[PDB]
Write an enzyme that holds these catalytic residues in place. Structure first.
Site, PDB file in Angstrom:
ATOM      1  N   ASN A  46      -6.827 -19.760 -10.188  1.00 16.91           N
ATOM      2  CA  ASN A  46      -8.091 -18.926 -11.045  1.00 16.91           C
ATOM      3  C   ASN A  46      -8.269 -18.138  -9.893  1.00 16.91           C
ATOM      4  OD1 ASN A  46     -10.773 -19.091  -9.080  1.00 16.91           O
ATOM      5  ND2 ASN A  46     -10.902 -20.111 -10.205  1.00 16.91           N
ATOM      6  N   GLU A  85       0.537  -1.240  -0.542  1.00 20.46           N
ATOM      7  CA  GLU A  85      -0.190  -0.236   0.134  1.00 20.46           C
ATOM      8  C   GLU A  85       0.524   1.463   0.109  1.00 20.46           C
ATOM      9  OE1 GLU A  85      -2.787  -0.301  -0.606  1.00 20.46           O
ATOM     10  OE2 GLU A  85      -4.100  -2.239   0.330  1.00 20.46           O
ATOM     11  N   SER A 110     -11.598 -19.930  -5.711  1.00 23.05           N
ATOM     12  CA  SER A 110     -11.005 -19.780  -6.033  1.00 23.05           C
ATOM     13  C   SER A 110     -10.927 -20.009  -3.728  1.00 23.05           C
ATOM     14  CB  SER A 110     -10.087 -18.296  -5.202  1.00 23.05           C
ATOM     15  OG  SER A 110     -10.100 -17.508  -7.023  1.00 23.05           O
ATOM     16  N   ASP A 156      -5.706   6.397  -4.840  1.00 22.47           N
ATOM     17  CA  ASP A 156      -4.940   5.268  -5.086  1.00 22.47           C
ATOM     18  C   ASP A 156      -5.674   4.705  -6.394  1.00 22.47           C
ATOM     19  OD1 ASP A 156      -8.302   4.074  -5.635  1.00 22.47           O
ATOM     20  OD2 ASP A 156      -8.006   2.867  -4.536  1.00 22.47           O
TER      21      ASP A 156
END
Ligand SMILES: c1cc2sccc2s1
Length: 162
Positions: A132, A11, A117, A20
């Site tokens: 996946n 981040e 998943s 972002d």
């Protein structure tokens, strides 16, 4: 390595309001302020979050405080989610960090798209789960970060973070 160090890498840390990867006003260590295109709305959210008039800027300590709250809330949200809790509880500590990371980035609405998943992860079919996981908007929009998180799910090691 731990969840804080991992998310700090993924981040970054910025002390002024920035947009972002999705164009949304954010601050600190991935603290989303609002999806509104109005900077004033973001500034209001910031002031509410910090408890003072910040005029779009915070300190490192304040960023780390939001980060502590956000990580805590992410993990607690997982435990409160009937779909996510059994999968999370089935995982080892390192893979739990990958799960927290994904939820931190995408939210629970985001991870809801990941039924298949999740099942593979719960089955401990790691290579299949990793294949996946990459068949996703998530992967395509943030491939370098998703690759790190997926490697963490695949291996249960911190190899992708050093
Ligand atoms: C709880 C488990 C898992 S695996 C990927 C996201 C989440 S949340």
């Amino acid at each position: 390595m731990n969840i804080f160090e991992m998310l700090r890498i993924d981040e970054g840390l910025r002390l002024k309001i920035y947009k972002d990867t999705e164009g949304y006003y954010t601050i600190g260590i991935g603290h989303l302020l609002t999806k509104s295109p109005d900077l004033n709305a973001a500034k209001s959210e910031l002031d509410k979050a910090i408890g003072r008039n910040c005029n779009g800027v915070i300190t490192k300590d304040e960023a780390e405080k939001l980060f502590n709250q956000d990580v805590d809330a992410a993990v607690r949200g997982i435990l409160r989610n009937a779909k996510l809790k059994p999968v999370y509880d089935s995982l080892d500590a390192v893979r739990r960090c990958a799960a927290i990371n994904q939820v931190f980035q995408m939210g629970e609405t985001g991870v809801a798209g990941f039924t298949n998943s999740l099942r593979m992860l719960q089955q401990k079919r790691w290579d299949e789960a990793a294949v996946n996981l990459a068949k996703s908007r998530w992967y395509n929009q943030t491939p370098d970060r998703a690759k790190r998180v997926i490697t963490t799910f695949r291996t249960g090691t911190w190899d992708a973070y050093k």
